[PDB]
Symmetry: C3
Subunit: 53 residues, 3 copies
């Protein structure tokens, strides 16, 4: 009752912490990937600038 | 008092869930965005390889 | 135990709140960064279409 309510609130809080932890991990991986493409574009710009007539 | 404290905590829990659901949509947009630029850079890299002398 | 448990729940709500605020900022920075790379790839694509 109070105990079931409190039990439910605890479990939902644990669910929400688990959900933000998953988002944090996916966002960390996305930011890493964006760093990788930044590198790739930079290399393509360097190339093109070196090849420029 | 118990009822007011527990109502405030339950309402906040719903508020937090809502905020995390909004950040999920944004996060998936960043994942989609990274995917689209990945494809675009790969398409350039390949063009530049194909066109080289 | 209930007042201590309630105290813990409320502290964890405040800390969830701070984590959501920090992830808002990181998402915003990540969007900005994406938009910057999109523009750079767009400029490359237009340059290449012009030299074709
Ligand atoms: Cl919560």
């Amino acid at each position: 009752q109070a105990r079931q309510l409190l039990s439910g609130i605890v479990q939902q809080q644990n669910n929400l912490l688990r959900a933000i932890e998953a988002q944090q991990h996916l966002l960390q991986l996305t930011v890493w990937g964006l760093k990788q493409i930044q590198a790739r574009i930079l290399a393509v710009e360097r190339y093109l600038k070196d090849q420029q007539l």
